[PDB]
Design a protein around this ligand. Structure first.
Ligand SMILES: C[N+](C)(C)c1ccc(CNC(=O)c2cc3cc(OCc4ccccc4)ccc3n2Cc2cccc(C(=N)N)c2)cc1
Ligand SMILES: [Ca+2]
Length: 223
């Protein structure tokens, strides 16, 4: 997160850290046994870390659970990043509480202007690298489709939306990938891609979760 703020320990209870000996992506807990992340975060040997604040220190509240299955969307395209969504089934159910809780799936898509909270342990620098120990937060609005497509002509599909600031200075960045974009208590987006980070006129692009609710539900029901 570039230009964001320190969330506060356990203030984003649905936020998970995907770990493989180091933090490589974020995710969202949608129930006691399932996490939603980005398809581009896929890899074997994923350990899901819940209840985390400082990812480099054991402080209490953490629950480390191995991924049982990682289900990348069947139509995911790695070149266009279309359908950049993945479900991860936990080997065992997480212990839900005040520090570890699931986020609701939306029943309808969010409109331009809606303010959302984006969080993650990704790079905090637009130019260079600087990874935080603790979770960073950023409130950003969903942009109009017209502004999104004019920023990335020919690259925005119906399963993507832009959120952020055209002036630059505030944006999600690498490391935040797979993480949540929550608006009004509902998971509306997943950190997907963009050009650089917090660059002027190059806002972040996110996976439009409302287009996948039926898929998520049907997949979870059959697994
Ligand atoms: C769809 N296209 C083809 C355009 C495409 C395909 C893959 C890609 C893949 N490239 C990346 O996504 C990526 C790697 C990376 C490393 C650094 C800074 C930004 C980075 N990005 C964008 C990035 C990652 C996470 C969040 C943000 C953000 N600024 N909100 C930006 C980039 C573009
Ligand atoms: Ca920790």
């Amino acid at each position: 997160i570039v230009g964001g703020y320190t969330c506060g320990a356990n203030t984003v209870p649905y936020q998970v850290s995907l770990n493989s000996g180091y933090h490589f992506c974020g995710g969202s807990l949608i129930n006691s046994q399932w996490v939603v992340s980005a398809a581009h975060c896929y890899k074997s040997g994923i350990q899901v870390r819940l209840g985390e604040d400082n990812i480099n220190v054991v402080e209490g509240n953490e629950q480390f659970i191995s991924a049982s299955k990682s289900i990348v969307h069947p139509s995911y395209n790695s070149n266009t990043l279309n359908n950049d969504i993945m479900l991860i089934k936990l080997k065992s159910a997480a212990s839900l509480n005040s520090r570890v809780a699931s986020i609701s799936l939306p029943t309808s898509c969010a409109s331009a202007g809606t303010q959302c909270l984006i969080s993650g342990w990704g790079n905090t620098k637009s130019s260079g690298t600087s990874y935080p120990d603790v979770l960073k937060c950023l409130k950003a609005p969903i942009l109009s489709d017209s502004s999104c497509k004019s920023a990335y002509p020919g690259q925005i599909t119906s399963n993507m939306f832009c959120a952020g600031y055209l002036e630059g200075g505030k944006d999600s960045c690498q490391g935040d990938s797979g993480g949540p974009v929550v608006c009004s208590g509902k998971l509306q987006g997943i950190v997907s891609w963009g050009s650089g980070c917090a660059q002027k006129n190059k806002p972040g692009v996110y996976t439009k979760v409302c287009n996948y609710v039926s898929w998520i539900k049907q997949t979870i029901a059959s697994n």
